[PDB]
Write a structure and sequence with these properties.
6 helices, two-stranded antiparallel ribbon, 7-stranded parallel beta sheet, about 280 residues, alpha/beta
Length: about 280
């Protein structure tokens, strides 16, 4: 399948070169997979989600996304126009308040929630979790992410936006999950992207158009935007049967575009997520 005039990041993940604008992908499109977006919520009523999104858990007075961040990330995973995996099922877990903030204890509870809640959902092709959040190093936060991964969920986490080594941030620094840095449309490391040996992969993160609250759209930047590209890619590849939740991060690294990014610090992987789709 071909989506013309796609957001640059979608085009990038199906291309061996920057500078194109059509997204190519197998029409299975992540059908039969599920992606949890652990964030500020999801505006599931947005036309872009087509009834495939739903809130399953909140730790606050509403499950509604009063911020936009979670809706934007969910859109990059799986919206019809802005999403990588256009037929996946999206499940929202609201661990962040409408200012985008959340306590680590709540975030940990949300991760353990997903590890159990997947047993209440129909995801025959597999389960992914997208975590566009983080703070300073916490062994307890890292352990929660490790448990979620161990339970059979492909965990993708943002590297962080400090232009610093991600070893000092959580859950970015957990070795067993997939830690995602950000790139721009010219294949440069995004100016704010964290780096370091703990990164597994880069995805598009600068000037990413996606869904927003109020049935709208906007373009914003962050490792929060790169992470759902990778989460959606994992769901798409799992639906194709090419990989599993336990092996998807390694598979994405195996099949990535290699050596094409600029300003990658010595010792950080130079790997850009790529779907390897041959139309």
């Amino acid at each position: 399948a071909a989506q013309t005039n796609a957001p640059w990041g979608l085009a990038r993940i199906s291309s061996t070169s920057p500078g194109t604008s059509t997204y190519y992908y197998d029409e299975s499109a992540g059908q039969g997979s599920c992606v949890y977006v652990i964030d500020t919520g999801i505006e599931a009523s947005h036309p872009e989600f087509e009834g495939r999104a739903q809130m399953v858990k909140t730790y606050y007075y509403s499950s509604r996304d009063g911020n936009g961040h979670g809706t934007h990330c969910a859109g990059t995973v799986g919206s019809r126009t802005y999403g990588v995996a256009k037929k996946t099922q999206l499940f929202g877990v609201k661990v962040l308040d409408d200012n985008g903030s959340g306590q680590y204890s709540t975030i940990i509870a949300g991760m353990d929630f997903v590890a159990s809640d997947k047993n209440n959902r129909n995801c025959p092709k597999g389960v992914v979790a997208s975590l566009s959040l983080g703070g300073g190093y916490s062994s307890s936060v890292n352990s929660a992410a490790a448990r979620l991964q161990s339970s059979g969920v492909m965990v993708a986490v943002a590297a962080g936006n400090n232009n610093a080594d991600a070893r000092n941030y959580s859950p970015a620094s957990e070795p067993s999950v997939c830690t995602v840095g950000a790139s721009d449309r010219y294949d440069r490391r995004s100016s704010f992207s964290n780096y370091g040996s703990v990164l597994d992969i880069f995805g598009p993160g600068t000037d990413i158009l996606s869904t927003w609250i109020g049935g709208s759209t906007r373009s914003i930047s962050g490792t929060s935007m790169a992470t759902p590209h990778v989460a959606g890619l994992a769901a798409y590849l799992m639906t194709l049967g090419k990989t599993t939740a336990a092996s998807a991060c390694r598979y994405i690294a195996d099949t990535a575009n290699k050596g094409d990014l600029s300003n990658i610090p010595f010792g950080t992987v130079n790997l850009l997520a790529y779907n390897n789709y041959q139309a």
